[PDB]
Amino acid sequence: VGSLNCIVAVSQNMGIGKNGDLPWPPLRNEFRYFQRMTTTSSVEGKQNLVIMGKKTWFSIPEKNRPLKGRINLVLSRELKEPPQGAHFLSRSLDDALKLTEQPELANKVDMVWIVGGSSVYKEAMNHPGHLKLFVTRIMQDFESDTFFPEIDLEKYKLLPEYPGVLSDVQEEKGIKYKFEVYEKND
């Protein structure tokens, strides 16, 4: 297991979802970015592991589940078995990671990516150790029901730039957004 990262798209009000749906219209380039990042292994012969909650898992069109090219790990305490189409199930992030430290996935996983939800984002942010926040900022308010927890700038530094991430404003569907990387280690 290489790096631990969280990837998220948040609106201006800090909204990540509305009724299991995204608060804004689909953004094809936001999607491509999310797929490239999570799928691209920094090491040949290895795969990235994407960790998500049950809600997140069920929020993706089936057509797209599991996220191909990556190991899908759903986090649940009520499921007794992995949803249809998923590869592993854990009760917690502490357990999903130990799983990685098993000879099972021992020698198969590069980087580990958390794709949601809040709860999952919140246990990653408590995980002591090195952590990178890959944030996509949508520059508008959008009716949301779930949120990204607030980032503590006293612990997370905003990087001036990152290889492979565009620094200027993007626009798709009259909607503006930018890419940001935050890094912690404490």
Ligand X SMILES: COc1cc(N(C)C[C@H]2CCC3=C(C2)C(N)=N[C@H](N)N3)cc(OC)c1OC
Q: Given the rule CB under 6 A, which residues bind ligand X? A: 7-9, 22, 26, 30-31, 34, 59-61, 64, 67, 115-116, 136
Nearer to ligand X, 19 or 101 (CB): 19
Q: How far is the CB of 171 from ligand X (least distance, A)?
A: 16
Known binder of ligand: residue 117?
A: yes
CA gap 133, 137 in Å, rounded: 12
Q: Please identify, using beta-carbon distances, which residue of 88 and 177 lies nearer to ligand X.
A: 177
Go through the chain and tell me how many residues it has.
186
Please indicate if the annotation marks 65 as binding a ligand: no
Annotated ligand binding at 116? The verdict is yes
Give the nearest distance from C-beta 37 to ligand X in angstroms.
8
Give 36 or 98: the residue with its C-beta nearer to ligand X: 36
Supply the residues annotated as catalytic.
22, 30
Quote the CA–CA distance of 181 and 77 in Å, as a whole number. Answer: 30
Ordered DSSP codes for 121-176:
HHHHHHS-SEEEEEEEEESS----SEEPPPP-TTTPEEPS--TTS--S-EEETTEE
What element of type H or E holds 177? strand 175-185
Q: Are 70 and 49 in contact (CB under 8 A)?
A: yes
The answer on whether 118 is annotated among ligand-binding residues is yes
What is the closest distance, in whole angstroms, from the C-beta atom of residue 76 to ligand X in the complex?
17
Binding residue positions for substrate: 30-35, 64, 70
